[PDB]
Design a binder for this molecule. Sequence first.
Ligand code: ZN
Ligand code: ZN
Lengths: 326, 329
Amino acid sequence: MIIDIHGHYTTAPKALEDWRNRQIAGIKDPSVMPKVSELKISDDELQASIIENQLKKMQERGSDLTVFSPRASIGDFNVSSTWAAICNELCYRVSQLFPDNFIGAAMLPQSPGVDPKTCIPELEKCVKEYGFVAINLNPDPSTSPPLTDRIWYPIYEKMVELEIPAMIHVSGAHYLNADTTAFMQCVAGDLFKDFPELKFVIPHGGGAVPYHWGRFRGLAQEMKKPLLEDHVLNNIFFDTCVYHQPGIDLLNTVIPVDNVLFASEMIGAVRGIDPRTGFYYDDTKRYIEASTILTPEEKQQIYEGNARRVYPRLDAALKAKGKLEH
Amino acid sequence: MIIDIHGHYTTAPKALEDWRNRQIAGIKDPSVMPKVSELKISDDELQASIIENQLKKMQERGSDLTVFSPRAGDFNVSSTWAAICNELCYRVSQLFPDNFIGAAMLPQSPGVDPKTCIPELEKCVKEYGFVAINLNPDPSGGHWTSPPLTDRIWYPIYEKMVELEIPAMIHVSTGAHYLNADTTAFMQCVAGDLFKDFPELKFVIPHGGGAVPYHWGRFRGLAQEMKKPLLEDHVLNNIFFDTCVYHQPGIDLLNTVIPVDNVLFASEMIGAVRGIDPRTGFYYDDTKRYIEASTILTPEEKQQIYEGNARRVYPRLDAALKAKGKLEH
Ligand SMILES: [Zn+2]
Ligand SMILES: [Zn+2]
């Protein structure tokens, strides 16, 4: 099967965004602050948003399952907490309506300078009650402390406990910078010495990392660290959200197959068609299929094998599903 | 010949760093404020620092000329520090005129109008014979509290740049902040339309453009979303990338998606990465090796990357080279 580990619910009924606008307006004008019970979205509206969009494209592109999370894009913790709760529950409802095609990843109620421990309640709820298989961890909710700082340790302890990886994800290309920064911080520190089980997924093919792989190998060398293969590659993985063959080829040239996870982040940032290839920039499965560097077996690793090892909760959910249908 | 457009004077005598620390401690404690006359750096110390390091490596690696610039409070402080650092690079160029040509460091400072950098800029170009400047897009240092390169606040500098025919290398002062700055600078230009007002303006984005080439599809797609013209016309007549990409696969990608006209040789030696790749036995930053080993570039295209493009992007450098060969036949 084909598993897309990076996708956001960008097609939600307008009622969701309307509620958000009321909430945001309520920050400066508490008189217009909305109540959670005021948000009403029916299953019919939910089903329509999926069938006409994500589901349709997955069928046309040959994707079977997407790890589905709330879209990225300030108030205090109260605002963030309420908003994350709403967004996660909607992704959960989508997974219930289309259990074979969507499984959730959680948005955390982070807030600038607020202790990450405040996000544990939502994290646990999503994993235990909604069956989510990973979390989206924002390294810079805004100066934000590096991922190697102990402020993040309570989240890491929970991630190891529940066996869930974290996609480093910030909220026109700022996200590419965050990917590179996250990787650099890990190379500079020794986080995985403290949490050997910890797994991070850095999107967009690792930001600029593969393109500057020699620089990072050289930096680890000067800092007297072990080779990257051992220092970070048993803990850091990259998704395939690279929108052109040359980039995908570079990715598969310098990054081990074990560290590459299929993803496309469809109906997101880039929704146009590349006039030179004739197909959509984000139809990334085509770049993997077209690859002459990867063997058939390695492509299957990228499509499913790797995600099932990096996301233990996902592997368990898939094994249980086939057992019930049998 | 082979021209390296990216290199910093990273081998200066300790006297420089010591003076700097004193100046920094002076902003808070005026009693420890050092005087410029207190900085002692002799010609012999400069020669030794170059002969044993940059010059030696250039010879071993087969590089001929490096565009040499200073290593990565208020205006008075920055003005003094910049003047000191630029003068040192100038002194190096006087001591080794065939191997080093200066690139100016501007005395930028947060909250200070960039136009105040013109004096030092003109001095370096007219008096020191510098051929370019290093423009810091975020003088605040990671704050990003500074306006985008497309903002009117920078025009005064662009005016002087177009007038004096000098390009600017987008360069910032965390372990990989420079890579992020490169990508951001490119994105800002794509999002805006600075070159509409400055058709002749030229920016050089180091480190192979940060992450731009690796995500070329994404940028072409974003250009489409924003209804902008094709990148080739929208920015590639004004933006160029250097070859400070420390591995063959990266260089090959650069040469797969970026036109040869937009690629300029550079290695930024004796800088961030000074080690040897155990899998090849060669230094990571010996970038000429990647260009030479390229099976994508033709002999002519390689020469374009080694000297042709730099002489086109750096008009003052091209002129100085012609004068040198003429006045001396
Ligand atoms: Zn995303
Ligand atoms: Zn530099």
